[PDB]
Amino acid sequence: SSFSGKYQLQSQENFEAFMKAIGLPEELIQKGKDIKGVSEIVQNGKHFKFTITAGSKVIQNEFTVGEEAEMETMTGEKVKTVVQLEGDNKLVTTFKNIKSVTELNGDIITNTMTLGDIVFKRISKRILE
Amino acid sequence: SSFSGKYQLQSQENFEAFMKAIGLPEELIQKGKDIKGVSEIVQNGKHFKFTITAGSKVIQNEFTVGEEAEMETMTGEKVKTVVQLEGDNKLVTTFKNIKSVTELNGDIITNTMTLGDIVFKRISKRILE
Ligand SMILES: CCCCCCCCCCCCCCCC(=O)O
Ligand SMILES: CCCCCCCCCCCCCCCC(=O)O
């Protein structure tokens, strides 16, 4: 129903392989690969604000689903794309050669990004406030 | 007694002036100044683990009070210093020309970094799980 909350990373797969594939420096990969931080989502109807802890970087993006928006990626590149809401619990978008699906089930968010034959998956749990 | 917990930044003063004085790139100052992230502290006796969201960077440091420790600063530089316990609710250290005081008051942490005539102050509030 609502994505709003603070979410702590529980596990992830293929962080190193994905970050290498997009061109992150090996130094940033090693610094960030073991960080289990907190991301925050604020949802207001179709409007979303994301404060994402991704490795050693914090990325803050904001978008209304269905509208074109500029979003900062891991590389510092700003891509223009549209994020769609599928049902009430799935955010879907594509940018460059990456497909991203953010799914909320109960208190768990599973983020799956696919780049070629690499599936980068992040599993995070809502902090119960 | 215990600093352990997750803390969300509530307010801060003089971020830009402090970051300019330590030589942070201007582009990192502008994108980091409005981020209100979550920092985590794990305390075990005199041993501390810090996962700090500072602007658009995540910094992870460890140390034991009273023992010389190597710590990453906001610029990525590593410094060797000693962190002291003043009372039971203040952590205090000096490195380069900066004095840092971390004070716990119930659910509020206040961090005061002083550099010459600039006082950079962060107030964070414990996330109640
Ligand atoms: C699509 C632009 C964002 C680029 C950042 C990529 C890093 C992984 C993104 C996952 C964020 C999804 C929110 C759930 C919480 C989390 O996994 O931190
Ligand atoms: C001693 C250098 C550590 C890193 C320097 C980054 C500047 C911000 C330091 C604030 C750390 C205090 C932790 C309490 C919670 C917080 O304010 O995030």
Side-chain angles (χ1 to χ4, degrees):
Chain A
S1 190
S2 174
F3 279 81
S4 293
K6 291 180 180 64
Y7 298 86
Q8 176 151 49
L9 190 64
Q10 305 293 293
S11 62
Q12 71 191 330
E13 304 170 350
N14 286 326
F15 177 95
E16 299 91 342
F18 184 89
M19 296 305 169
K20 201 184 87 72
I22 62 173
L24 259 214
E26 275 272 61
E27 8 279 304
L28 277 170
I29 300 182
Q30 302 306 311
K31 290 187 67 184
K33 70 178 176 60
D34 296 322
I35 293 173
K36 286 185 158 50
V38 175
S39 296
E40 181 164 33
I41 306 177
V42 186
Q43 180 186 359
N44 279 291
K46 294 188 302 188
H47 178 272
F48 289 79
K49 181 177 172 189
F50 278 79
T51 301
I52 302 164
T53 301
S56 71
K57 304 178 62 163
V58 180
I59 297 162
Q60 190 157 270
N61 280 323
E62 174 184 358
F63 55 82
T64 299
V65 294
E67 320 269 25
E68 198 175 47
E70 203 161 69
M71 286 153 50
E72 179 184 354
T73 69
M74 275 298 291
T75 61
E77 190 173 2
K78 284 196 167 182
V79 295
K80 234 178 174 182
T81 191
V82 179
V83 185
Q84 303 286 6
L85 185 68
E86 194 165 299
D88 50 324
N89 72 322
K90 244 189 274 195
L91 297 162
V92 185
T93 190
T94 54
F95 56 96
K96 311 185 80 175
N97 37 9
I98 298 166
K99 183 178 70 266
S100 179
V101 177
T102 311
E103 179 168 4
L104 173 68
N105 305 106
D107 288 319
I108 302 299
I109 283 190
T110 303
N111 202 78
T112 307
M113 301 174 83
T114 301
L115 181 49
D117 303 326
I118 303 180
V119 181
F120 169 41
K121 184 168 65 173
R122 292 171 57 105
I123 297 168
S124 300
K125 176 159 65 173
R126 183 142 47 188
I127 296 170
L128 301 181
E129 296 183 84
Chain B
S1 287
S2 178
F3 281 81
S4 292
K6 303 176 208 312
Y7 297 89
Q8 181 159 50
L9 187 64
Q10 304 294 296
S11 60
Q12 62 184 350
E13 294 198 328
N14 306 313
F15 177 95
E16 176 174 346
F18 183 89
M19 295 304 166
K20 287 192 175 177
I22 66 163
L24 208 66
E26 285 292 327
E27 42 276 356
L28 286 188
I29 297 172
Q30 286 308 291
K31 67 166 44 195
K33 53 189 301 296
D34 293 322
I35 292 179
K36 283 185 172 43
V38 174
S39 295
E40 181 158 32
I41 303 174
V42 179
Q43 175 179 358
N44 290 284
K46 286 186 160 179
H47 187 84
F48 285 84
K49 175 170 188 177
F50 283 81
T51 302
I52 299 157
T53 299
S56 63
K57 306 185 72 165
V58 182
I59 299 174
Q60 207 157 237
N61 280 319
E62 279 188 59
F63 57 84
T64 297
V65 166
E67 304 205 316
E68 172 180 295
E70 170 169 285
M71 291 162 41
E72 182 181 335
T73 70
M74 187 68 179
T75 64
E77 179 183 351
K78 289 203 188 304
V79 298
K80 302 192 193 79
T81 187
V82 172
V83 183
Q84 286 180 345
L85 260 177
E86 178 189 322
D88 71 315
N89 67 328
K90 294 183 198 171
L91 300 160
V92 182
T93 184
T94 45
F95 56 97
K96 307 174 87 170
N97 45 347
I98 300 167
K99 182 182 191 166
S100 182
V101 175
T102 307
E103 185 168 13
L104 176 64
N105 163 210
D107 286 339
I108 304 291
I109 289 192
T110 305
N111 201 72
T112 302
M113 282 174 170
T114 307
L115 178 46
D117 297 289
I118 301 165
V119 177
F120 167 47
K121 200 173 74 178
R122 297 163 62 100
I123 302 173
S124 300
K125 181 175 154 75
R126 184 193 306 285
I127 294 162
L128 290 182
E129 308 180 65

